[PDB]
Design a protein around this ligand. Sequence first.
Ligand SMILES: *C(=O)[C@H](C1=C(N)C[C@@H](C(=O)O)C1)C(F)(F)F
Lengths: 404, 404
Amino acid sequence: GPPTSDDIFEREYKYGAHNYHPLPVALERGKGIYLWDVEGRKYFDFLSSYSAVNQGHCHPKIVNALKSQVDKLTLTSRAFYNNVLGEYEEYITKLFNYHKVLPMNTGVEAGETACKLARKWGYTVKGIQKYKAKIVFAAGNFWGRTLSAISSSTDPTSYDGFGPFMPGFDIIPYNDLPALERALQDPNVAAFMVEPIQGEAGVVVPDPGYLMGVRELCTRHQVLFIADEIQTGLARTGRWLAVDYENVRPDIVLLGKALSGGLYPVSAVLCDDDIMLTIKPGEHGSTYGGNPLGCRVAIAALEVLEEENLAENADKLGIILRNELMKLPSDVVTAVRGKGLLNAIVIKETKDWDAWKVCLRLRDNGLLAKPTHGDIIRFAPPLVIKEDELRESIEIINKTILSF
Amino acid sequence: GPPTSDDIFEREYKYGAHNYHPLPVALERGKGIYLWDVEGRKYFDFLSSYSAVNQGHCHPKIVNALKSQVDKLTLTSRAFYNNVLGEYEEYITKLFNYHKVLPMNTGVEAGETACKLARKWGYTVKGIQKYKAKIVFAAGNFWGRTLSAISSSTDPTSYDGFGPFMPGFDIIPYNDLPALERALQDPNVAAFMVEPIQGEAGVVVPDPGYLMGVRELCTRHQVLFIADEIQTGLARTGRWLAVDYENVRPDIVLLGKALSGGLYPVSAVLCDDDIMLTIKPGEHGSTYGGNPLGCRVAIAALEVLEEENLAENADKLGIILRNELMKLPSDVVTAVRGKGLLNAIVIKETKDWDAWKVCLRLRDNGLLAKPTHGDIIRFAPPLVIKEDELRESIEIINKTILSF
Ligand SMILES: *C(=O)[C@H](C1=C(N)C[C@@H](C(=O)O)C1)C(F)(F)F
């Protein structure tokens, strides 16, 4: 017969690096909001592959886009033109209202690209002396695992044993406009990179007016505002971009994860000509960036978000979800936070009760969620979920919580 | 009607970043060794998407693996297990005879992973003081476009304007064993990372015995030998790994590009337990790394290379290609170099005549190649090419080169 779940666990333990400690579930099929493991059990997916499958698993429109293109052409490299890339470029730039896009594959590649743009613009436009340019980041940030990305992290698990670290990266507290203003007094700062909601830190939502104040300070001091929307973008928080809640237009927007509906690693860096064109031909690239197969699925993934009005659904259903989670007792859950369908709860963890235990029992009751800290659980189902599916999930959550 | 080639160029110029200056040809289909542009013209592909379509464009076996899996499950994220990853991990580790593999998406992510492994092993096993670890690179190296990767580059187009740079990277000449021996006197060196053939630098082939000498010096001084085979591996030079020509075993091997046959960004870091397990759960990863869709594609891509004996074909046909190119007059072609089907010619560049114009005319005569410097042209067709097709291509190259 086929492998069991324990077969799958031990094969990976023997032949794969040990860089992850996954929840013990061996999944074999996904469709829409549901996942199935190899034993045939069905689960509500309340992680959405860290918001990569906003459109649900294996969305038919995106799948058909991939199957149509894979028989024609999948990779020319950027040494030549292909017929798909410019169609995607015109589409995504008009959708988010920026001049240009630079295509990359993974989220951390988008962030590295943004750092390279900020520095090159800092030297060639702002007039910073080489190589004194600084980029400011917020404590709690997460944007990947390259040496550069971990050099801006305040989490020791990310950076311990991996130094020495990239110079020119400064860290300030999140949700702290006076701290930002102080940092931007230095004219060698080229950019501030920030998540409009910090996902990895525990769905940390900054105070109203924070994004508007970041925009005001960056513009005043001639500093690029880089908004990392790789997790928060693409309807997850109830808008095309989380910055849309305060009408804020960043200088550079990063997109990734759900840009492909989970079918292909596609990321994007959006900005206007005066920034984008500081990088000349030959000065930045990627083998697979902008390939025609990824472009076709990104177009379809974006079309799904717009056609099915998933931002409106995430906003309306997130209100219901937060409202129902807030009914849970306050000797069990200490806080409920989030926007749209990016939410989290904080449990009152004791010496013998934590969030990993809760998620194990949620899995036993047919709902998959992952804990982000010893006391925080994220709830992020695909945006295609309907109200009755959500209420059935809320039921599983309520029953699981108080069954402790 | 459909966009013309000029339409396609103009649209990318308007909506896409200008980080590339591609050869002006607009492809819409490819299969095997051939590409078709939107006007319907047919071309020999002598770039193979930088050796990512070693198996030829749209290889039916790889396409079938992608189409079969895209219906089932494409991305769970590493928070859970999927049933495919461990089958791939077992397959690739047994094929290359290393204990373990760490899956990533792009080549530069694999190189970043190797640098992190080297540093972590350097501090936790070798005993180097934090954070004094060094990694030595060879001048001319290329391993991607992150801030860390360009920090080791000697090509100003890669790094100029993008600093300040990552510390702890040292540079020595390529193909220079005395220089490596002198560099490895520093006990703080954790690793030497090197390409068995430098592709981006213009297909620079080191002297016989270089790789053996590298392995000897790295072992003698307790330094990790990291072999970057993202371009040279996977039958391109006539072996599973280019280091097989000298039968040496690196401590870490990097694979990328053709690991998917061009259908998906998949890369891999191979090494034994003593190195791999220095990275603990939660200390490294990637959203799309190890997803089931990429794994299914990679298994099929590797099976194609094995089943069709593409290494043997590249070895046999590459010597024919080089011998025929060497018959051109020295007034025109000053050097021919390569291994297997990774080859280049050096032309006698004048002020009126350069590699770009040769490649423009090659395109006019039905063959696509790209210059890597003003006087170097790479010739690297897919490894499924047949001898008669190669000889037809050689006639095109002869006619084009001698037509000036
Ligand atoms: C691949 O072997 C190599 C290239 C990269 N690496 C990135 C790609 C690009 O710049 O788009 C080209 C080379 F050396 F060109 F072949």
